[PDB]
């Protein structure tokens, strides 16, 4: 998948303003991430789209149909989208299986086709052995995965996922996220993810909308957000940074306590502001010979948002490395791989 | 702080084993992190400590007093610890102010001392302007912080914190955890945190217990857990790693297709195994000319699991970086330009 457009949307609770003149589009098949500080309005936005909250002005359209505006306000039932709530509350008196079955057909999961879709959701999320559990019989991350499976089962053209993975250990989240998003993309599905995992957003988002106090500071690709953030607030939200008051010079540097540093800016010389350094930009020299120095050949370089993925031939194997930046090889190909420190060795009774 | 002793503790549900021969110890004022894959038994362990669940076997003692055993089983209200449940669960019919007041004195929050302590908790967690709200008027991360404020207000000698920060954006979680753990340490408090944030555990834990399928895989300092893991299983849970089939040599190197690499092991030469390299150990050379170079002097050097914390006098600042004798001269390089934001 669905297109979505939200135009000038605003929402207040009593004297409490929360969404302030928000505009946002989602293209068919697009994976959009919405991120921002606690309390900035993410869940309220999703609830306004799904019809659980009523905006007090603005417009919302979904796949070419107005669903909210000065003269329309469709019931939740008439809004063709899926919405995994941040609470992920399951029906207490239903089994995991029957929770997942709920949004398919008559809800009972008696048909072979339902059984097969439900089992596929259980396998994706790694909870097949818990199909007969009731929700009170589950850990926090097991309950989270069952809620995710139930949301995903009907495979809506648009799905809104409000922190679908926040209770899950890293390796688990990484597997589910990759398998799930590949499958959404394979099927042309549109999705909006709320996340506060910076690496997740940078890796998987087509575009990221960064919110602050009910407004959108910036909506951009991961590469543009990270390297060309609109604001210092956006820059600090998307990554760690070390900041100093600074005065811009005319030669592409700025002065700060640390020193005179090259800086990306087109503002006039004499502008005052703040300069930000990413911790990965620093190194200290000289350096000891590395534990191992190996000769390597660069096969392929692929820029990502905040790193470059390098394909390598070193010794007699090929590795892929993620590094803050690419090496300068007068050759374009000839490099030296360093290992810092001993590796670990495990005798592996496999 | 209060010391804690858990001894050969187990628990099954129905006929479903969930905690299996847990032993675990906490010295006064120690900060322990418990981590492990989803379903491994972290919350069940905490519930058994707090008396919400009853173990089948084993002993729990608190500051030297046996609280669970074959012959003893102190009710919840009698166990002198605080416990922040992974759901948080605020009292829905009380404001945030009265929720945080609840564990102080008569719960009314009418004494100047109570008002002061509630203000301290509202400020630590950044929710001062929400203190008049009810829980259903709050965002998920605000509800989480109010629940944390409520649990921390009585300042118990032992506090159990099951995922107290999981709904919070990075800057917020960093500030709250730095301020709060510094305060706990300054006051000598003992704390057990459950987390799945690896950096967090490695930075703040005095020890980390890694659980797997109901058992303790390894309990150790962050340095030991990360640099001497018990298990390729434990190694990969605590951090990333690139692996290679390798064969052990006798000079403390291992053969693998990448080369003859120095390795840490005591095993017998000839042992075939897996070599594991952490991503931080890799670099590719040569690097580009640096955008800038700043002369620096090393002030101090604090070893951590994945890096060393170095204090440096450079230009006209002191900078502290995660990246050598503590008085040496060195040069800081900056790779690429910094960003500049007009005021
Ligand atoms: N009534 C019950 N019957 C059977 N198993 C149960 C019951 N209650 C909990 N469990 C199981 O106990 C195991 C441990 O649960 P616990 O909540 O302690 O895990 P956790 O480590 O805190 O998980 P997470 O990281 O997902 O929060 C889980 O596998 C869960 O399925
Ligand atoms: N009934 C209400 N009355 C007044 N303010 C409310 C009410 N409900 C929510 N809010 C406020 O609206 C703002 C947006 O809340 P929302 O749940 O959308 O935030 P969020 O970005 O999802 O936050 P988090 O990251 O903490 O989950 C918050 O500051 C919250 O306190
Ligand atoms: Ca939210
Ligand atoms: Ca748990
Ligand atoms: Ca070989």
XYZ file of C-alpha atoms and ligand atoms in Angstrom:
758
model
C 2.141 -2.988 -0.944
C 0.000 0.000 0.000
C 0.854 3.662 -0.523
C 0.149 5.949 2.382
C 0.113 9.709 2.623
C -0.244 11.826 5.735
C -0.529 15.562 5.197
C -0.258 18.254 7.916
C -1.468 15.913 10.635
C -1.846 17.322 14.180
C -2.996 15.866 17.456
C -3.407 17.203 20.996
C -4.623 15.653 24.251
C -6.417 18.391 26.197
C -3.856 21.161 26.555
C -1.186 18.675 25.448
C 0.062 18.979 21.836
C 1.708 15.761 20.570
C 1.805 15.608 16.750
C 2.528 18.934 15.156
C 1.790 19.415 11.419
C 3.310 16.055 10.329
C 3.572 15.134 6.629
C 4.888 11.762 5.507
C 4.440 9.486 2.488
C 5.166 5.806 2.094
C 5.713 4.313 -1.405
C 4.315 0.899 -2.339
C 6.777 -1.768 -1.243
C 8.786 0.738 0.823
C 10.210 -0.184 4.303
C 10.084 3.012 6.330
C 11.648 3.289 9.846
C 10.396 5.940 12.265
C 12.816 6.734 15.101
C 13.094 9.388 17.803
C 13.359 10.208 21.452
C 11.021 8.713 24.091
C 7.778 10.661 24.039
C 8.250 12.214 20.564
C 4.881 10.843 19.164
C 5.739 7.609 17.253
C 2.997 5.389 18.727
C 0.483 8.222 18.590
C 1.211 8.581 14.814
C 0.662 4.854 14.231
C -2.539 4.907 16.292
C -3.793 7.846 14.231
C -3.123 5.905 10.980
C -4.823 2.748 12.283
C -7.824 4.749 13.566
C -7.286 4.154 17.328
C -6.656 7.816 17.818
C -8.526 10.630 16.109
C -6.304 13.457 14.754
C -7.645 16.941 15.260
C -6.586 18.145 11.822
C -4.806 17.042 8.623
C -5.345 14.230 6.148
C -4.550 10.528 5.762
C -4.969 8.429 2.669
C -4.206 4.752 2.196
C -3.701 3.190 -1.258
C -5.429 6.081 -2.969
C -8.419 6.273 -0.629
C -8.893 9.082 1.881
C -9.385 7.538 5.282
C -9.250 10.684 7.390
C -9.783 14.369 6.621
C -12.140 17.270 7.275
C -15.014 15.205 5.949
C -14.056 11.580 6.508
C -13.031 9.342 9.413
C -13.191 5.650 8.609
C -13.649 3.082 11.377
C -10.732 0.856 12.277
C -12.524 -1.958 10.516
C -12.447 -0.095 7.200
C -8.708 0.567 7.251
C -6.906 -2.159 5.367
C -3.655 -2.424 7.355
C -2.015 -4.586 9.991
C -0.794 -3.040 13.275
C 1.409 -4.730 15.853
C 0.904 -2.623 19.021
C 3.970 -1.860 21.253
C 2.319 -3.778 24.157
C 1.792 -6.804 21.872
C -1.104 -8.050 24.143
C -2.283 -11.611 23.205
C -5.726 -13.120 23.963
C -5.213 -14.687 27.410
C -7.664 -17.600 26.957
C -6.256 -18.602 23.590
C -3.362 -20.909 22.847
C -0.332 -19.468 20.894
C -1.651 -21.385 17.897
C -5.116 -19.929 18.213
C -3.680 -16.400 18.759
C -1.827 -16.688 15.472
C -4.891 -18.219 13.814
C -7.065 -15.316 14.882
C -6.659 -13.028 11.860
C -6.971 -15.764 9.193
C -10.498 -16.614 7.907
C -12.981 -17.522 10.632
C -10.204 -17.350 13.242
C -10.206 -20.994 14.312
C -7.161 -22.289 12.372
C -8.939 -25.586 11.523
C -8.126 -25.593 7.798
C -5.014 -27.154 6.328
C -4.110 -23.866 4.688
C -4.374 -21.997 7.956
C -2.347 -24.702 9.705
C 0.424 -24.316 7.170
C 0.533 -20.492 7.419
C 0.505 -20.634 11.241
C 3.341 -23.167 11.307
C 5.364 -20.984 8.918
C 4.966 -18.027 11.325
C 6.024 -20.306 14.217
C 9.105 -21.427 12.332
C 10.088 -17.862 11.303
C 9.862 -16.754 14.908
C 11.356 -19.849 16.491
C 8.470 -20.742 18.773
C 7.109 -23.963 17.128
C 7.432 -25.867 20.406
C 5.164 -23.339 22.203
C 2.103 -23.649 19.957
C 0.006 -25.119 22.764
C 1.095 -22.644 25.427
C -1.175 -19.941 26.750
C 0.298 -16.464 26.899
C 0.735 -16.543 30.705
C 2.953 -19.555 30.089
C 5.545 -17.628 28.016
C 8.670 -15.505 28.619
C 8.634 -11.814 27.544
C 10.437 -12.423 24.224
C 8.357 -15.536 23.540
C 5.152 -13.463 24.030
C 6.625 -10.772 21.749
C 7.303 -13.321 19.015
C 3.834 -14.818 19.228
C 2.312 -11.277 18.867
C 4.545 -10.659 15.875
C 3.508 -13.983 14.307
C -0.180 -13.127 14.795
C 0.283 -9.727 13.128
C 2.250 -11.179 10.275
C 0.014 -14.220 9.628
C -2.639 -12.440 7.452
C 0.171 -10.809 5.446
C -1.474 -7.364 5.022
C -0.406 -5.062 2.117
C 0.684 -2.512 4.732
C 1.934 -3.506 8.225
C 2.791 -1.129 11.087
C 5.255 -2.674 13.549
C 5.713 -0.834 16.830
C 8.886 -2.189 18.398
C 8.381 -5.756 17.228
C 11.793 -7.021 18.443
C 12.706 -4.987 21.524
C 12.564 -7.901 23.998
C 14.802 -10.201 21.877
C 18.479 -11.007 22.341
C 20.716 -9.765 19.496
C 21.275 -13.000 17.515
C 17.579 -13.867 17.666
C 16.496 -10.380 16.576
C 19.011 -10.474 13.761
C 17.699 -13.742 12.293
C 14.038 -12.877 12.545
C 14.558 -9.360 11.187
C 16.475 -10.527 8.134
C 14.113 -13.403 7.302
C 11.028 -11.297 7.871
C 12.123 -8.243 5.935
C 13.422 -10.297 2.994
C 10.049 -11.971 2.809
C 8.114 -8.638 2.975
C 10.285 -7.292 0.203
C 9.991 -10.479 -1.898
C 6.234 -10.099 -1.709
C 6.042 -6.385 -2.525
C 4.701 -5.541 0.939
C 4.890 -2.039 2.503
C 5.971 -1.671 6.190
C 6.520 0.960 8.789
C 8.844 -0.052 11.621
C 9.314 1.860 14.862
C 12.758 1.077 16.248
C 15.405 2.640 18.523
C 18.184 0.325 17.226
C 20.359 2.580 15.111
C 22.106 -0.221 13.260
C 18.843 -1.924 12.433
C 17.391 1.251 10.856
C 20.636 2.008 8.904
C 20.771 -1.532 7.559
C 17.120 -2.187 6.642
C 15.307 1.114 6.047
C 14.679 2.478 2.591
C 14.106 5.770 4.392
C 14.191 6.829 8.011
C 11.944 9.470 9.508
C 13.481 11.043 12.612
C 10.916 12.684 14.916
C 11.377 15.133 17.787
C 8.528 16.710 19.815
C 5.812 15.757 17.391
C 7.572 16.935 14.205
C 9.722 15.279 11.588
C 13.273 16.625 11.686
C 14.283 14.741 8.566
C 13.180 11.894 6.347
C 15.996 10.498 4.301
C 17.848 7.346 3.146
C 20.177 5.804 5.760
C 23.227 7.095 3.802
C 21.851 10.651 3.650
C 20.718 10.689 7.275
C 24.084 9.498 8.574
C 26.372 11.551 6.346
C 24.210 14.561 5.743
C 22.047 14.933 8.824
C 19.741 17.990 8.742
C 20.315 19.009 12.453
C 22.654 18.283 15.230
C 19.701 16.510 16.944
C 19.275 14.212 13.984
C 23.031 13.549 13.878
C 23.174 12.587 17.577
C 20.061 10.466 17.305
C 21.454 8.290 14.520
C 24.885 7.756 16.064
C 27.307 8.542 18.872
C 29.186 11.783 18.403
C 31.697 13.965 20.191
C 30.743 17.607 19.948
C 32.564 20.955 20.376
C 31.563 24.617 19.974
C 33.125 25.755 16.703
C 33.813 28.693 14.453
C 33.841 28.153 10.718
C 36.799 29.306 8.629
C 36.924 30.003 4.924
C 39.246 27.151 3.943
C 36.927 24.306 4.843
C 38.037 24.006 8.457
C 36.536 25.151 11.764
C 38.285 26.108 15.030
C 37.346 24.371 18.310
C 39.245 23.554 21.550
C 40.617 20.379 19.984
C 42.182 22.170 17.067
C 41.601 23.387 13.568
C 39.622 20.630 11.807
C 38.305 19.986 8.261
C 34.576 20.144 8.368
C 31.713 19.575 5.970
C 29.656 22.715 5.648
C 28.673 25.259 3.057
C 27.862 28.038 5.573
C 29.746 31.361 5.467
C 33.072 31.782 7.201
C 32.454 33.337 10.624
C 29.342 31.290 11.292
C 29.354 29.821 14.801
C 27.903 26.406 15.686
C 28.931 22.928 16.784
C 31.188 20.395 15.216
C 30.642 16.662 15.574
C 33.096 13.862 15.303
C 32.111 10.161 15.065
C 34.169 8.075 17.543
C 35.188 5.757 14.722
C 37.055 8.646 13.050
C 39.714 8.677 15.752
C 42.947 6.659 15.937
C 46.187 7.138 17.892
C 49.658 6.690 16.438
C 52.223 5.187 16.179
C 51.049 1.575 16.247
C 52.936 -1.628 16.982
C 53.415 -4.082 14.180
C 50.171 -6.044 14.085
C 50.041 -9.567 15.543
C 49.667 -10.644 11.917
C 50.197 -8.608 8.736
C 48.794 -10.398 5.726
C 48.833 -9.354 2.040
C 45.330 -8.970 0.614
C 43.441 -8.233 -2.631
C 40.291 -6.086 -2.703
C 37.682 -7.787 -4.843
C 34.703 -5.488 -4.274
C 33.862 -2.344 -2.289
C 30.243 -1.495 -1.393
C 29.460 1.702 0.518
C 26.720 1.485 3.174
C 25.321 4.141 5.485
C 28.045 4.306 8.068
C 30.488 1.640 6.860
C 31.905 0.138 3.699
C 31.572 -3.555 3.002
C 34.866 -4.927 1.567
C 35.289 -8.259 -0.184
C 38.797 -9.555 0.288
C 41.317 -12.216 -0.761
C 43.857 -12.638 2.073
C 46.393 -15.446 2.458
C 44.339 -18.177 0.800
C 40.772 -17.295 1.700
C 38.212 -14.565 1.024
C 36.690 -12.525 3.845
C 34.132 -9.763 3.871
C 34.939 -6.929 6.244
C 32.979 -3.916 7.428
C 35.274 -0.968 7.931
C 34.668 2.729 8.737
C 36.092 3.590 5.309
C 37.965 2.142 2.365
C 41.771 2.008 2.177
C 43.685 4.113 -0.361
C 45.343 1.671 -2.707
C 47.495 3.315 -5.386
C 46.662 0.105 -7.101
C 42.928 -0.011 -6.392
C 43.451 -3.610 -5.291
C 46.617 -4.292 -3.298
C 46.231 -4.040 0.469
C 47.622 -5.303 3.748
C 45.307 -6.912 6.299
C 46.375 -6.413 9.919
C 45.257 -8.498 12.896
C 45.505 -6.749 16.256
C 46.119 -9.289 19.051
C 45.727 -13.086 19.222
C 42.602 -14.725 17.955
C 40.611 -17.090 20.155
C 40.893 -20.857 19.689
C 38.211 -23.386 20.611
C 38.749 -27.153 20.531
C 35.356 -27.952 19.037
C 33.911 -31.360 19.919
C 31.604 -31.190 16.897
C 25.531 -3.805 50.081
C 23.208 -6.736 50.638
C 24.940 -10.000 49.766
C 23.079 -12.795 48.021
C 23.685 -16.539 47.808
C 21.887 -18.936 45.471
C 22.840 -22.628 45.802
C 21.952 -25.490 43.467
C 18.546 -23.919 42.659
C 16.057 -25.541 40.231
C 12.540 -25.147 38.989
C 10.310 -26.951 36.462
C 6.784 -26.012 35.443
C 4.352 -28.820 34.842
C 7.020 -31.224 33.571
C 8.908 -28.396 31.800
C 12.371 -27.770 33.301
C 13.259 -23.996 33.357
C 16.043 -23.452 35.947
C 18.619 -26.171 36.349
C 21.081 -26.259 39.210
C 21.720 -22.520 39.390
C 24.427 -21.403 41.781
C 25.223 -17.718 41.869
C 26.671 -15.312 44.359
C 26.625 -11.563 44.869
C 28.906 -9.614 47.226
C 27.654 -6.430 48.948
C 27.458 -3.560 46.470
C 28.375 -5.801 43.572
C 26.615 -4.997 40.221
C 25.753 -8.247 38.420
C 24.304 -8.483 34.927
C 22.424 -11.609 33.922
C 22.207 -12.180 30.183
C 21.131 -15.078 27.940
C 18.953 -15.982 24.972
C 15.194 -15.535 25.038
C 13.487 -18.228 27.169
C 16.681 -19.132 29.055
C 15.200 -18.469 32.559
C 16.318 -14.943 33.545
C 12.984 -13.631 34.769
C 12.151 -16.985 36.449
C 15.408 -16.699 38.468
C 14.472 -13.183 39.572
C 10.932 -14.262 40.493
C 12.322 -17.094 42.654
C 14.632 -14.613 44.429
C 11.771 -12.192 45.038
C 9.466 -14.994 46.224
C 6.955 -14.689 43.387
C 7.856 -18.219 42.311
C 8.867 -21.188 44.431
C 11.889 -23.232 43.418
C 11.699 -27.030 43.607
C 15.139 -27.341 45.113
C 18.143 -25.366 46.343
C 18.867 -22.601 48.810
C 18.494 -18.806 48.668
C 20.083 -16.640 51.344
C 20.054 -12.821 51.637
C 22.631 -10.884 53.702
C 23.487 -14.101 55.530
C 19.908 -15.071 56.336
C 18.485 -18.164 54.698
C 15.239 -17.047 52.865
C 14.520 -20.189 50.874
C 15.336 -23.807 51.653
C 13.778 -27.203 52.359
C 12.662 -25.748 55.730
C 12.174 -22.014 55.030
C 10.268 -19.893 52.524
C 9.898 -16.234 53.452
C 6.856 -14.528 51.991
C 7.450 -11.786 49.430
C 6.723 -8.898 51.771
C 9.403 -10.145 54.160
C 12.295 -10.316 51.705
C 14.357 -7.154 51.974
C 14.939 -6.453 48.320
C 13.343 -4.297 45.596
C 12.268 -5.896 42.256
C 11.353 -4.075 39.058
C 9.356 -6.586 36.968
C 10.007 -6.770 33.215
C 6.423 -5.567 32.569
C 6.962 -2.537 34.937
C 3.216 -2.629 35.873
C 2.342 0.862 37.409
C -0.801 1.180 39.634
C -3.224 2.420 36.954
C -5.421 4.281 39.434
C -2.605 6.411 40.884
C -0.719 9.316 39.282
C 2.989 8.938 38.466
C 3.624 11.087 41.594
C 1.690 8.693 43.857
C 3.142 5.638 42.156
C 6.664 6.825 43.032
C 5.479 7.930 46.520
C 4.018 4.464 47.166
C 7.115 2.768 48.540
C 8.071 5.649 50.858
C 6.617 5.833 54.405
C 2.851 5.785 54.397
C 2.826 6.245 50.549
C 1.129 9.661 50.672
C 4.153 11.651 49.573
C 3.373 14.420 52.035
C 6.654 14.868 53.927
C 9.309 17.263 52.623
C 11.778 14.389 52.639
C 9.423 12.278 50.472
C 8.803 15.155 48.111
C 12.582 15.621 47.804
C 13.162 11.916 47.090
C 10.363 11.811 44.459
C 11.848 14.939 42.785
C 15.212 13.153 42.740
C 13.711 10.177 40.968
C 11.670 12.289 38.542
C 14.840 14.217 37.618
C 17.072 11.133 37.284
C 14.605 9.588 34.835
C 13.669 12.775 33.033
C 9.903 12.607 33.690
C 9.317 15.618 35.982
C 6.644 17.154 33.689
C 4.669 13.904 33.740
C 4.250 13.498 37.436
C 0.573 14.509 37.339
C -0.284 11.944 34.626
C -1.853 8.542 35.125
C -0.061 5.546 33.548
C -2.552 5.346 30.611
C -1.507 8.933 29.750
C 2.123 8.008 29.141
C 4.255 6.659 26.305
C 5.828 3.220 26.646
C 9.251 4.626 27.509
C 7.697 7.126 29.998
C 5.753 4.300 31.701
C 8.999 2.297 31.905
C 10.850 5.218 33.546
C 8.067 5.870 36.019
C 8.196 2.200 37.022
C 11.952 2.421 37.433
C 11.496 5.604 39.585
C 8.948 3.794 41.765
C 11.292 0.824 42.349
C 14.386 2.973 43.023
C 12.714 5.483 45.368
C 12.970 3.360 48.605
C 16.651 2.748 47.738
C 16.667 -0.951 48.767
C 19.979 -2.596 49.794
C 19.436 -5.092 46.956
C 17.510 -4.188 43.810
C 16.526 -6.580 41.026
C 15.974 -4.802 37.716
C 14.460 -6.883 34.896
C 15.090 -4.921 31.702
C 14.608 -1.466 33.168
C 15.710 0.442 29.996
C 14.532 -1.691 27.071
C 12.001 0.861 25.717
C 14.388 3.858 25.829
C 16.244 5.532 22.990
C 20.011 5.416 23.164
C 20.870 8.932 24.556
C 18.238 8.554 27.295
C 19.253 5.004 28.295
C 22.891 6.066 28.383
C 22.316 9.032 30.672
C 19.930 7.257 33.043
C 22.158 4.197 33.353
C 25.363 6.219 33.896
C 23.686 8.452 36.552
C 21.875 5.641 38.261
C 24.686 3.086 38.450
C 27.125 5.792 39.651
C 24.599 6.613 42.443
C 24.141 2.933 43.379
C 27.909 2.474 43.606
C 28.420 5.694 45.570
C 25.780 4.413 48.053
C 27.163 0.910 48.252
C 23.946 -0.655 46.865
C 23.868 -4.186 45.352
C 22.014 -4.605 42.075
C 21.190 -7.332 39.611
C 20.344 -6.153 36.067
C 18.843 -8.252 33.281
C 19.925 -6.892 29.884
C 20.439 -7.924 26.290
C 22.538 -4.832 25.475
C 26.130 -6.313 25.228
C 27.944 -2.960 25.434
C 25.926 -2.063 28.492
C 26.755 -5.278 30.340
C 30.460 -5.056 29.419
C 30.715 -1.433 30.513
C 28.870 -1.561 33.830
C 28.895 -5.134 35.200
C 31.320 -6.173 37.950
C 30.406 -9.692 36.797
C 28.221 -11.132 34.091
C 26.347 -14.417 34.402
C 25.468 -15.870 30.994
C 22.539 -18.292 31.150
C 21.670 -20.958 28.565
C 18.654 -23.294 28.648
C 18.279 -22.787 32.375
C 21.905 -23.150 33.451
C 24.790 -20.759 34.076
C 27.125 -21.125 31.121
C 29.759 -18.796 32.532
C 29.889 -16.180 35.292
C 32.886 -13.830 35.030
C 34.139 -10.241 34.846
C 33.377 -8.475 31.566
C 37.082 -8.696 30.595
C 37.257 -12.477 31.249
C 33.871 -13.221 29.651
C 34.801 -11.382 26.416
C 38.519 -12.353 26.177
C 38.400 -15.848 27.721
C 34.970 -17.217 26.908
C 34.177 -20.728 28.119
C 32.547 -21.678 24.872
C 32.368 -20.694 21.194
C 28.723 -20.497 22.214
C 29.518 -17.995 24.991
C 31.982 -16.141 22.744
C 29.340 -15.407 20.108
C 26.619 -14.429 22.580
C 28.781 -11.722 24.183
C 30.084 -10.297 20.855
C 30.511 -10.717 17.082
C 33.228 -12.927 15.637
C 34.585 -14.209 12.339
C 35.452 -17.915 12.514
C 37.842 -20.254 10.681
C 38.632 -23.925 10.991
C 42.116 -24.039 12.461
C 44.743 -26.431 13.716
C 46.723 -25.744 16.820
C 50.515 -25.556 16.665
C 52.957 -25.791 19.525
C 54.372 -22.267 19.510
C 51.048 -20.666 20.368
C 49.878 -20.081 16.832
C 47.146 -21.847 14.875
C 47.037 -22.718 11.193
C 44.036 -21.548 9.183
C 43.537 -20.631 5.483
C 44.052 -17.000 6.309
C 47.529 -17.777 7.714
C 49.565 -18.743 10.765
C 47.872 -16.682 13.442
C 48.916 -16.147 17.052
C 46.212 -17.576 19.302
C 45.283 -17.950 22.968
C 45.026 -21.544 24.087
C 46.577 -24.099 26.401
C 45.160 -27.082 24.544
C 47.394 -29.758 23.072
C 49.282 -28.925 19.899
C 47.549 -30.655 17.021
C 44.145 -29.985 18.486
C 41.911 -29.129 15.546
C 39.375 -26.438 16.404
C 37.922 -23.084 15.416
C 39.838 -19.782 15.452
C 37.690 -16.702 16.263
C 38.626 -13.163 15.361
C 36.677 -10.176 16.798
C 35.696 -7.476 14.230
C 37.611 -4.788 16.154
C 40.849 -6.726 15.624
C 40.741 -6.311 11.783
C 42.042 -3.325 9.807
C 42.868 -2.815 6.094
C 45.979 -0.987 4.988
C 47.064 1.468 3.811
C 44.553 4.058 5.173
C 44.003 7.423 3.508
C 45.912 10.484 4.701
C 44.229 11.756 7.843
C 42.062 14.866 7.625
C 43.856 16.140 10.721
C 46.547 15.187 13.216
C 46.636 16.505 16.761
C 49.555 16.122 19.107
C 48.459 14.361 22.261
C 49.826 13.248 25.593
C 48.497 10.081 27.266
C 47.141 10.861 30.728
C 45.656 7.454 31.697
C 44.738 4.026 30.377
C 41.773 1.936 31.519
C 41.520 -1.540 29.942
C 37.997 -2.750 29.029
C 36.605 -5.840 27.324
C 36.704 -4.569 23.721
C 38.975 -1.554 23.930
C 41.073 0.635 26.168
C 39.739 3.816 27.637
C 42.433 6.474 27.108
C 42.453 9.950 28.624
C 44.306 12.416 26.464
C 45.375 16.041 26.672
C 45.105 17.262 23.056
C 44.946 20.763 21.664
C 43.306 22.651 24.501
C 41.027 19.910 25.823
C 41.030 16.663 27.659
C 39.349 13.986 25.599
C 38.450 10.475 26.673
C 38.314 7.896 23.891
C 37.776 4.185 23.514
C 40.399 2.857 21.161
C 51.113 2.627 25.919
C 52.672 4.277 28.969
C 50.657 6.965 30.773
C 52.779 10.020 30.008
C 53.825 9.195 26.458
C 53.362 11.505 23.456
C 51.174 10.333 20.632
C 49.315 11.688 17.630
C 45.537 11.532 17.197
C 44.384 11.081 13.640
C 40.964 12.019 12.356
C 39.761 10.074 9.328
C 37.678 12.395 7.101
C 36.080 15.757 7.925
C 33.898 16.421 10.943
C 30.322 17.637 10.538
C 29.486 21.278 11.265
C 26.092 22.535 12.299
C 25.497 26.338 12.191
C 23.985 27.606 15.435
N 3.636 -22.049 33.017
C 4.722 -22.398 32.262
N 4.821 -23.612 31.685
C 5.853 -24.010 30.940
N 6.904 -23.200 30.683
C 6.920 -21.938 31.178
C 5.822 -21.443 32.011
N 6.140 -20.183 32.370
C 7.351 -19.904 31.802
N 7.797 -20.955 31.086
C 9.043 -21.118 30.325
O 10.178 -20.841 31.142
C 11.272 -20.436 30.340
C 11.980 -19.290 31.077
O 11.095 -18.160 31.096
P 11.660 -16.708 31.541
O 10.500 -15.764 31.467
O 12.407 -16.925 32.786
O 12.720 -16.471 30.338
P 13.650 -15.142 30.057
O 15.033 -15.692 30.071
O 13.302 -14.079 31.071
O 13.117 -14.913 28.537
P 13.129 -13.514 27.691
O 14.556 -13.203 27.359
O 12.284 -13.971 26.503
O 12.388 -12.524 28.555
C 10.685 -20.039 28.997
O 11.123 -20.971 27.984
C 9.185 -20.144 29.169
O 8.637 -20.711 28.010
N -3.852 10.846 27.503
C -2.744 11.601 27.332
N -2.669 12.849 27.844
C -1.619 13.657 27.674
N -0.506 13.258 26.995
C -0.461 12.009 26.445
C -1.576 11.099 26.577
N -1.217 9.966 25.952
C 0.025 10.110 25.457
N 0.474 11.346 25.780
C 1.762 11.979 25.447
O 1.933 12.036 24.021
C 3.358 11.994 23.727
C 3.596 10.937 22.601
O 3.403 9.623 23.186
P 3.765 8.339 22.261
O 3.316 7.057 22.963
O 3.294 8.597 20.856
O 5.348 8.507 22.271
P 6.507 7.527 21.620
O 7.354 8.297 20.647
O 5.890 6.288 21.042
O 7.397 7.260 22.923
P 8.278 5.962 23.449
O 9.492 6.054 22.556
O 8.584 6.330 24.911
O 7.454 4.707 23.315
C 4.089 11.595 25.017
O 4.821 12.722 25.540
C 2.984 11.229 25.976
O 3.259 11.550 27.354
Ca 5.857 4.057 21.758
Ca 12.243 -12.011 30.753
Ca 46.644 -24.222 5.404
